[PDB]
């Protein structure tokens, strides 16, 4: 008849007192035990429908694309993004900005861009003389630069303190959003928005980044050559000029700054966080890293830079990376959707504008597709022959009309960066493999590995 079943809420508090202090995901997994794969949780003042397991998620996002393709808000960042840029946009705005962003994210190839950065990385790693480091900044630098060369038309130097400062702001912002306070804000932002909190810090952090984008936009405006756009910013300026007599053009300055922030954020914090978990995992499972290195020796050798064409011949490294993405579960609850029209779903009726969380973690840890899903195991992506076994449960980019638009770039990045590093270095740290704790630092919107030190030791 009406909504999916779930725990009875209270006025004001919704289902607070039935939640798990450990976080939203935990709370929803305990609801799943009781209600199955489709259920409603009242997050403070409203109902949110949760969909779990790959069948239910694909049925929503793919078979019912017409209904499930809207974007819900993330309360920690809505006040800043306010429905601007491709991530947080709906309706015609989304259509326009998605199309724009997909097209201009192809148009020097992305591969060559990543291969070049990979060489600067190796260089930077050789200069560190196997010193200990927390590699967050470095993994952010390499991925940010890929997006920077596309968006801004250049890369930044690794020791540029201003680049650093922006990366430190993404890092902090993503943690803050994913923190327990940020998960609470999701429930009670109406009330909490009047007090001091991490929500004001996030807001401020994003504004500092946006100010640089502001500047760079103006620099681009002044030096723009309409016959020779240099990058994604130039290209958007030209759409803007072309549509200036339409006051309702989506090619506005607010979309330009926030679409640009969106890309920059997505290109700096996703892949880098996955690599950071990946290198923690190589420290804890040195046998896996050793086996990857053997396949690199055999398929690539020690000198020739890895290339995307190498992937087909390296099923073991590919499986390891799939397993790194599966285990690291970057966005356990994905990004919020909303239904754009009244829909019937498995006998339930989900009114237009109901928020829908698609619990990607549930697909990724599905014990029918992955034997032992809480363990890190590259055999999850291998057949008996040792050939790559892809699976439809593997949905860490989501599915359907909102499927991550950086999937191709992200996978290229993970492959080239992971292989080029292990080609040239092994890893060490002062924590014994058996003592390494993989428990995330935060687990909210983002799952965020703990900080750790690592050394990269040149091979000889
Ligand atoms: C490990 C790498 C990445 C992962 C796991 C990832 C994951 C995701 C997920 C789960 C979504 C939400 C889809 C949904 O609403 O159902 C998403 C959205 C998005 N991602 Fe990624 N992403 C990654 C990297 C990137 C990169 C590198 C970029 C940009 C170059 C990017 C750009 C975007 C954009 C623009 C959206 C919003 C799509 C839309 O609403 O139309 N992502 N990503
Ligand atoms: C809000 C939600 C997600 C993100 C990171 C993100 C972006 C694009 N694709 C994957 C991850 C930042 C802010």
Curated annotation (Swiss-Prot):
Compartment(s) where it occurs, according to its Swiss-Prot or TrEMBL record: Endoplasmic reticulum membrane; Microsome membrane
Cofactors that this protein relies on: heme
Cited function: A cytochrome P450 monooxygenase involved in the metabolism of endocannabinoids and steroids. Mechanistically, uses molecular oxygen inserting one oxygen atom into a substrate, and reducing the second into a water molecule, with two electrons provided by NADPH via cytochrome P450 reductase (NADPH--hemoprotein reductase). Catalyzes the epoxidation of double bonds of arachidonoylethanolamide (anandamide) to 8,9-, 11,12-, and 14,15-epoxyeicosatrienoic acid ethanolamides (EpETrE-EAs), potentially modulating endocannabinoid system signaling. Allele 2B6*9: Has low affinity for anandamide and can only produce 11,12 EpETrE-EAs.
The protein's name in its UniProt record: Cytochrome P450 2B6
Induction profile: By phenobarbital.
Effect caused by changing residue 140 to H: In allele CYP2B6*6, allele CYP2B6*7, allele CYP2B6*9 and allele CYP2B6*13
Organism: Homo sapiens (Human)
Binding-site residues for heme, renumbered to this chain: 404
Stated consequence of mutating residue 19 to V: In allele CYP2B6*11
InterPro entries, per database record: Cyt_P450, Cyt_P450_CS, Cyt_P450_E_grp-I, Cyt_P450_E_grp-I_CYP2B-like, Cyt_P450_sf, Cytochrome_P450_fam2
Predominant location category: endoplasmic reticulum
PROSITE patterns assigned to the protein according to its UniProt record, in alphabetical order: CYTOCHROME_P450
């Amino acid at each position: 008849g009406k909504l999916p079943p779930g725990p009875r809420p209270l006025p004001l508090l919704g289902n607070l007192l039935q939640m798990d202090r450990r976080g939203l995901l935990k709370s929803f997994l305990r609801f799943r035990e009781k209600y199955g794969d489709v259920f409603t949780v009242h997050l403070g003042p409203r109902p949110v429908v949760m969909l779990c397991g790959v069948e239910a998620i694909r049925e929503a996002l793919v078979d019912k694309a017409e209904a499930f393709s809207g974007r819900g808000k993330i309360a920690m960042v809505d006040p800043f993004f306010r429905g601007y840029g491709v991530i947080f946009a709906n309706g015609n705005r989304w259509k326009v900005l998605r199309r724009f962003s997909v097209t201009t994210m192809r148009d020097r190839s992305v591969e060559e861009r990543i291969q070049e950065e990979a060489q600067c990385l190796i260089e930077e790693l050789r200069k560190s003389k196997g010193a200990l480091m927390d590699p967050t900044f470095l993994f952010q630098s390499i991925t940010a630069n890929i997006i920077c060369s596309i968006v801004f038309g250049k890369r930044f130097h690794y020791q540029d303190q201003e680049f650093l400062k922006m990366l430190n702001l993404f890092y902090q912002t993503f943690s803050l959003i994913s923190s327990v306070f940020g998960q609470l804000f999701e429930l009670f932002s109406g009330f909490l928005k009047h007090f001091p909190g991490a929500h004001r810090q996030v807001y401020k952090n994003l504004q500092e980044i946006n100010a640089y984008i502001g500047h760079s936009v103006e620099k681009h405006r002044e030096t723009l050559d309409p016959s020779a756009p240099r990058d994604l910013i130039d290209t958007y300026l030209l759409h803007m000029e072309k549509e200036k007599s339409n006051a309702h053009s989506e090619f506005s300055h607010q979309n330009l700054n926030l679409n640009t922030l969106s890309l920059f954020f997505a290109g700096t914090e996703t892949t880098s966080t996955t690599l950071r978990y990946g290198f923690l995992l190589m420290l804890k499972y040195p046998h896996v890293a050793e086996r990857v290195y053997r396949e690199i020796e055999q398929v690539i050798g020690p000198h020739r830079p890895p290339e995307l064409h190498d992937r087909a011949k390296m099923p073991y490294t590919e499986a390891v990376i799939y397993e790194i993405q599966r285990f690291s579960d970057l966005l356990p609850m994905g990004v919020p959707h909303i239904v754009t029209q009244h829909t019937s779903f498995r006998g339930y009726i989900i009114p237009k504008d109901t928020e829908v969380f698609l619990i990607l973690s549930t697909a990724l840890h599905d014990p029918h597709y992955f034997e032992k899903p809480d363990a890190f195991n590259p055999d999850h992506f291998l057949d008996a022959n040792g050939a790559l076994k892809k699976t439809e449960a593997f949905i860490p980019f989501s599915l359907g009309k909102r499927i991550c638009l950086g999937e191709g770039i992200a996978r290229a990045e993970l492959f080239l960066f992971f292989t080029t590093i292990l080609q040239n270095f092994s890893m060490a740290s002062p924590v014994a493999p058996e003592d390494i704790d993989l428990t995330p630092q935060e687990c909210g919107v983002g799952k965020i590995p703990p900080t750790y030190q690592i050394r990269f030791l040149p091979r000889h």
